[PDB]
Amino acid sequence: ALGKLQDVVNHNAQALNTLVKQLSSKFGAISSVLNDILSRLDPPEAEVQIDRLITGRLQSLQTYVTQQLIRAAEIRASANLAATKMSECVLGQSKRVDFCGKGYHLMSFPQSAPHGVVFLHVTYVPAQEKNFTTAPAICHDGKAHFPREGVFVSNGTHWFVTQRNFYEPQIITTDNTFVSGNCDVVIGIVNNTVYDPLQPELDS
Amino acid sequence: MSLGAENSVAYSNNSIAIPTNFTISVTTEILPVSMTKTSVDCTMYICGDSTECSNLLLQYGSFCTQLKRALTGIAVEQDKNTQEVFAQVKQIYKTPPIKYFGGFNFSQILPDPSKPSKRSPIEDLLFNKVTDLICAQKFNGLTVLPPLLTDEMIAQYTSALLAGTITSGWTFGAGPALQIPFPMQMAYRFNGIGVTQNVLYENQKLIANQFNSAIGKIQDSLSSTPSALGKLQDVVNHNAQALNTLVKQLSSKFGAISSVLNDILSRLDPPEAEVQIDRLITGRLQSLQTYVTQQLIRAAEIRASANLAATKMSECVLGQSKRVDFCGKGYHLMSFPQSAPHGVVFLHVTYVPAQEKNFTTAPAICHDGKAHFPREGVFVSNGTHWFVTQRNFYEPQIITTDNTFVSGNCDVVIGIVNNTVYDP
Amino acid sequence: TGVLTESNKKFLPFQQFGRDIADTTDAVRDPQTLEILDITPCSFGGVSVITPGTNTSNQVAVLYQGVNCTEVNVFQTRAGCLIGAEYVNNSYECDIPIGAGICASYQSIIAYTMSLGAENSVAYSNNSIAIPTNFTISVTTEILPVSMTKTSVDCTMYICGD
Ligand SMILES: *[C@@H]1O[C@H](CO)[C@@H](O[C@@H]2O[C@H](CO)[C@@H](O)[C@H](O)[C@H]2NC(C)=O)[C@H](O)[C@H]1NC(C)=O
Ligand SMILES: *[C@@H]1O[C@H](CO)[C@@H](O[C@@H]2O[C@H](CO)[C@@H](O)[C@H](O)[C@H]2NC(C)=O)[C@H](O)[C@H]1NC(C)=O
Ligand SMILES: *[C@@H]1O[C@H](CO)[C@@H](O[C@@H]2O[C@H](CO)[C@@H](O)[C@H](O)[C@H]2NC(C)=O)[C@H](O)[C@H]1NC(C)=O
Ligand SMILES: *[C@@H]1O[C@H](CO)[C@@H](O[C@@H]2O[C@H](CO)[C@@H](O)[C@H](O)[C@H]2NC(C)=O)[C@H](O)[C@H]1NC(C)=O
Ligand SMILES: *[C@@H]1O[C@H](CO)[C@@H](O[C@@H]2O[C@H](CO)[C@@H](O)[C@H](O)[C@H]2NC(C)=O)[C@H](O)[C@H]1NC(C)=O
Ligand SMILES: *[C@@H]1O[C@H](CO)[C@@H](O[C@@H]2O[C@H](CO)[C@@H](O)[C@H](O)[C@H]2NC(C)=O)[C@H](O)[C@H]1NC(C)=O
Ligand SMILES: *[C@@H]1O[C@H](CO)[C@@H](O[C@@H]2O[C@H](CO)[C@@H](O)[C@H](O)[C@H]2NC(C)=O)[C@H](O)[C@H]1NC(C)=O
Ligand SMILES: *[C@@H]1O[C@H](CO)[C@@H](O[C@@H]2O[C@H](CO)[C@@H](O)[C@H](O)[C@H]2NC(C)=O)[C@H](O)[C@H]1NC(C)=O
Ligand SMILES: *[C@@H]1O[C@H](CO)[C@@H](O[C@@H]2O[C@H](CO)[C@@H](O)[C@H](O)[C@H]2NC(C)=O)[C@H](O)[C@H]1NC(C)=O
Ligand SMILES: *[C@@H]1O[C@H](CO)[C@@H](O)[C@H](O)[C@H]1NC(C)=O
Ligand SMILES: *[C@@H]1O[C@H](CO)[C@@H](O)[C@H](O)[C@H]1NC(C)=O
Ligand SMILES: *[C@@H]1O[C@H](CO)[C@@H](O)[C@H](O)[C@H]1NC(C)=O
Numbered sequence: 001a002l003g004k005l006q007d008v009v010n011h012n013a014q015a016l017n018t019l020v021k022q023l024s025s026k027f028g029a030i031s032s033v034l035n036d037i038l039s040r041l042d043p044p045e046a047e048v049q050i051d052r053l054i055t056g057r058l059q060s061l062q063t064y065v066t067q068q069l070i071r072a073a074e075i076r077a078s079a080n081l082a083a084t085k086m087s088e089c090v091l092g093q094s095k096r097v098d099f100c101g102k103g104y105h106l107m108s109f110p111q112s113a114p115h116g117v118v119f120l121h122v123t124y125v126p127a128q129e130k131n132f133t134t135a136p137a138i139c140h141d142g143k144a145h146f147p148r149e150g151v152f153v154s155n156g157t158h159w160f161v162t163q164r165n166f167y168e169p170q171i172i173t174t175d176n177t178f179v180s181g182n183c184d185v186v187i188g189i190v191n192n193t194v195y196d197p198l199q200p201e202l203d204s
Numbered sequence: 205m206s207l208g209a210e211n212s213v214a215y216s217n218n219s220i221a222i223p224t225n226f227t228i229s230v231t232t233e234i235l236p237v238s239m240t241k242t243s244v245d246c247t248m249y250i251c252g253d254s255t256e257c258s259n260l261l262l263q264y265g266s267f268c269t270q271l272k273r274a275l276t277g278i279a280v281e282q283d284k285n286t287q288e289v290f291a292q293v294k295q296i297y298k299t300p301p302i303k304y305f306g307g308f309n310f311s312q313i314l315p316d317p318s319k320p321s322k323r324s325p326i327e328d329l330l331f332n333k334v335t336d337l338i339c340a341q342k343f344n345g346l347t348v349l350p351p352l353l354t355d356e357m358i359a360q361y362t363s364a365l366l367a368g369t370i371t372s373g374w375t376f377g378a379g380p381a382l383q384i385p386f387p388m389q390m391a392y393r394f395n396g397i398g399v400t401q402n403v404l405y406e407n408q409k410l411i412a413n414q415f416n417s418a419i420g421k422i423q424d425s426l427s428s429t430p431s432a433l434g435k436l437q438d439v440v441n442h443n444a445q446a447l448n449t450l451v452k453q454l455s456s457k458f459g460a461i462s463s464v465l466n467d468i469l470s471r472l473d474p475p476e477a478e479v480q481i482d483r484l485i486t487g488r489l490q491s492l493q494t495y496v497t498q499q500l501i502r503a504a505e506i507r508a509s510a511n512l513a514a515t516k517m518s519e520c521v522l523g524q525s526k527r528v529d530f531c532g533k534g535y536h537l538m539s540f541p542q543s544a545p546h547g548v549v550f551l552h553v554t555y556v557p558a559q560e561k562n563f564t565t566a567p568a569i570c571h572d573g574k575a576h577f578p579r580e581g582v583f584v585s586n587g588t589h590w591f592v593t594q595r596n597f598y599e600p601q602i603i604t605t606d607n608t609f610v611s612g613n614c615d616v617v618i619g620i621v622n623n624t625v626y627d628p
Numbered sequence: 629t630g631v632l633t634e635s636n637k638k639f640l641p642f643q644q645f646g647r648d649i650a651d652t653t654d655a656v657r658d659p660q661t662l663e664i665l666d667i668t669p670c671s672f673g674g675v676s677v678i679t680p681g682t683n684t685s686n687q688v689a690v691l692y693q694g695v696n697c698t699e700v701n702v703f704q705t706r707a708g709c710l711i712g713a714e715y716v717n718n719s720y721e722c723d724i725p726i727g728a729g730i731c732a733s734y735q736s737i738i739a740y741t742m743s744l745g746a747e748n749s750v751a752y753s754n755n756s757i758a759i760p761t762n763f764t765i766s767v768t769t770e771i772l773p774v775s776m777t778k779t780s781v782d783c784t785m786y787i788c789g790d
Binding site: 001002003004005008009012013016019023034053054057058061064065068071072075078079081082085101102103106113115116117118119120121122123124125126127128129130131132133134135151153162164165166167188 | 751754755756757758759760761762763764765766767768769770771772773774775776777779781783786787788789
């Protein structure tokens with residue numbers, strides 16, 4: 001589960017171990033110990049041997065610094081991503097798909113971890129879906145009615161309007177539908193009644 | 205050079221421009237995803253078949269282990285990049301056998317049964333348009349490793365994403381795939397960008413024709429432009445050029461008498477042959493470290509591009525994005541993924557307003573001593589009459605109490621005009 | 629050092645050797661009989677070992693990368709020759725990645741073409757919709773590295789010491 005953080009710790013420790021291990025490399029010289037080189041040779045050739053050790057160790061150190069810089073760039077990109085997730089997932093609700101978890105994102109919780117952050121993404125996942133017969137519009141009194149915020153569904157005999165992400169059937173009225181045009185243009189329009197709230201009021 | 209055509213917008217305090225038509229624009233975005241996976245035998249590259257060279261090479265320590273480990277990290281990173289970009293669905297969705305989607309034609313993007321590769325016409329064109337070097341690179345101890353996901357499986361992942369986005373819209377990306385008719389899905393997408401469902405339903409045939417025409421234009425545009433696939437070809441060129449340079453560096457003396465180790469052994473005594481082999485080893489080791497360093501930098505660049513491609517796949521293909529210019533130029537409707545060699549091509553279907561018309565606008569309508577504000581639209585005037593319309597399409601409607609809300613009197617709003625508000 | 633295969637290359641009478649695009653020898657003319665030979669270097673490969681945990685088993689499989697199986701439970705893959713695993717026509721999820729669509733798992737060690745996912749056909753029709761009737765509150769984890777170990781190196785002490 002925590003492979004990324006442990007991987008970063010492993011790379012840092014392994015890099016330091018390799019850099020420490022590189023001091024035991026002759027680099028084409030008689031010995032890897034500078035004290036032995038001084039204690040065994042005259043300055044004209046000791047200078048050459050120390051030069052060989054210096055160039056090898058300097059190459060090792062430059063290599064280590066170069067990989068440290070590349071890893072620093074990778075960790076900086078990951079930290080910028082983590083800051084973006086903290087701003088958009090924890091400090092607000094995000095409409096970006098898959099940015100703050102799988103599903104419709106609700107909220108997020110930050111947790112500290114060694115060299116890192118763990119985001120607990122609380123998301124809403126739809127479940128227990130049911131088939132319904134759908135229509136683009138409802139034809140009533142020669143007018144086309146479209147849903148304000150939902151979708152027209154039919155359970156087999158009756159037509160209702162429900163919200164798209166949860167099944168809550170409601171009677172098709174003028175309050176939750178809007179009229180645009182006649183019934184001759186929309187392809188697939190079905191005939192159904194549209195209830196009027198004012199009709200019982202003026203009737204009684 | 206000219207920066208652009210000069211356009212002066214007719215700004216005034218009470219005039220608005222409302223679109224009266226639209227264009228369905230499909231645009232292409234080419235993103236590199238992975239590189240060529242390379243492995244280098246450190247001993248074979250630096251020394252070949254010479255035992256004495258290997259013995260002298262051992263004095264330098266764990267350089268060979270570092271280079272092998274770095275290349276292995278890049279090689280696993282490329283497969284991780286491909287998994288992140290394409291393997292984002294765990295269900296392999298399929299299109300219905302009757303390819304009718306309410307007038308919308310997806311032949312150019314769905315897999316072709318006739319082709320053995322099971323690729324789309326666009327994907328087949330992309331593979332065709334992206335192209336003893338390999339043998340020499342192999343012969344010098346450098347090996348290219350095959351991608352973990354084969355081209356047919358990447359095409360299968362794109363097919364599953366296309367089938368999910370076409371039959372289920374954005375539902376499959378957020379949980380179970382819920383079937384929805386494609387006109388209703390396009391109406392939902394029109395609602396996402398602030399246009400009512402009626403505009404999509406009334407103009408369904410025109411929108412389908414525009415989308416089909418745009419897809420055909422996209423295929424022609426890719427087939428007719430040589431510099432369309434420059435990013436993927438550029439990545440292939442850099443990888444091949446790097447391997448060629450690394451192979452070419454074996455023919456460098458590096459300040460020694462000869463570049464051939466066999467000649468050095470066959471011509472000199474061990475006291476001076478050790479020095480010459482040392483010169484060759486240090487030069488070749490510097491070349492290999494340089495190659496690994498540029499491979500790591502390119503790996504970081506490709507990783508950033510792959511992260512961007514995964515973000516585009518999540519936000520543009522598996523949902524509708526409200527980020528401006530992230531999923532094409534225009535108001536984003538939907539996106540289609542296409543596999544390409546070492547990369548992904550996104551077909552962004554966007555809504556572009558067109559045929560705008562001037563109207564006289566007001567912030568509020570004063571009726572009966574009350575200020576009326578639009579619930580979802582804008583007040584427009586064609587010269588004599590006032591109407592309320594949606595902001596992104598011209599559909600004038602009578603100003604009523606149903607589509608306006610009352611807040612305050614008429615004495616505070618600057619620019620309020622007097623007009624009647626109908627009562628149902 | 630290399631294999632000398634038959635060559636289809638028609639040399640001009642004055643030419644003796646042959647070189648690649650990258651200046652590596654790829655052909656030669658025999659000086660005894662005027663025939664052309666394709667010098668191709670002998671096979672080499674990266675030996676990779678595919679093994680499960682030592683907690684479970686000690687069986688291993690060997691992958692010779694880039695090597696045909698005739699030049700080394702032997703199966704031929706596009707990645708190379710896999711020895712020690714038996715190909716199964718069934719498709720499962722990837723456990724140990726081999727390459728070119730081939731993955732390995734322990735059940736003996738088997739090699740198979742990995743399955744991308746479970747096959748689901750959505751019942752698309754022109755007038756049917758699926759509406760959710762319930763929901764699941766899902767909490768998922770995302771682990772992101774933020775910082776590294778801060779390292780400082782004394783250049784003089786590291787290279788030269790005392
Ligand atoms: C579709 O839904 C409606 C409303 O829930 C159902 O109508 C009711 O059905 C129950 C049981 O069948 C009756 O007791 C009620 O009297 C009905 N109400 C009305 C106003 O008729 C309808 O039966 C459902 N259709 C199907 C096929 O299940
Ligand atoms: C919906 O209702 C309209 C009007 O009641 C129907 O249109 C009529 O259809 C009949 C038979 O097809 C024709 O003889 C009439 O001339 C039509 N009248 C008009 C005004 O168009 C329509 O058929 C109904 N649709 C459905 C699916 O039942
Ligand atoms: C809206 O009206 C303005 C002004 O009445 C139009 O702006 C003019 O456009 C023409 C053509 O480019 C220019 O030559 C004029 O100089 C512009 N006038 C000003 C004051 O900027 C504008 O084109 C009209 N909009 C539409 C859609 O017709
Ligand atoms: C909106 O624009 C579309 C095209 O983008 C118009 O459709 C064109 O209509 C003309 C004349 O009616 C035809 O000659 C063209 O062939 C049509 N083009 C297409 C692609 O169908 C449409 O008429 C415009 N609508 C309005 C109200 O201006
Ligand atoms: C969907 O589009 C494809 C291609 O864009 C159409 O196929 C063309 O069909 C016409 C007439 O049959 C031929 O003249 C073309 O050569 C075909 N093009 C290709 C690339 O095959 C297809 O008819 C469209 N409609 C459907 C329902 O698939
Ligand atoms: C502004 O729009 C309104 C509504 O479309 C126009 O009013 C109609 O105009 C037509 C033709 O001029 C007449 O046949 C109708 O009788 C008018 N309806 C009403 C209710 O008056 C109006 O003319 C438009 N104004 C301008 C300057 O074009
Ligand atoms: C909008 O209507 C109001 C009320 O009918 C107008 O306010 C009147 O304006 C006249 C002349 O300017 C004054 O003599 C009245 O005393 C005003 N009455 C009130 C209650 O303020 C207003 O001028 C109209 N605005 C426009 C642009 O026609
Ligand atoms: C909605 O109805 C369709 C068809 O009536 C169902 O799809 C069937 O699902 C079963 C179980 O997987 C398959 O064996 C059939 O082949 C499917 N039929 C078709 C035409 O695809 C679907 O399961 C129903 N949805 C729900 C939620 O029950
Ligand atoms: C929606 O799903 C929840 C669970 O996700 C259902 O709650 C379960 O109800 C059954 C029987 O009523 C119990 O045995 C379980 O213990 C409940 N689970 C939990 C977690 O409370 C709920 O009934 C479902 N609602 C509908 C309308 O189907
Ligand atoms: C409206 O705009 C014109 C120029 O665009 C300006 O002269 C005028 O002062 C503005 N109206 C008000 C009330 O400031
Ligand atoms: C080489 O000598 C052999 C033996 O006499 C002869 O058969 C062959 O043709 C010779 N090749 C050339 C090029 O003269
Ligand atoms: C509705 O869909 C079926 C198959 O899904 C198709 O045969 C039929 O033609 C479609 N209806 C129309 C009006 O095209």
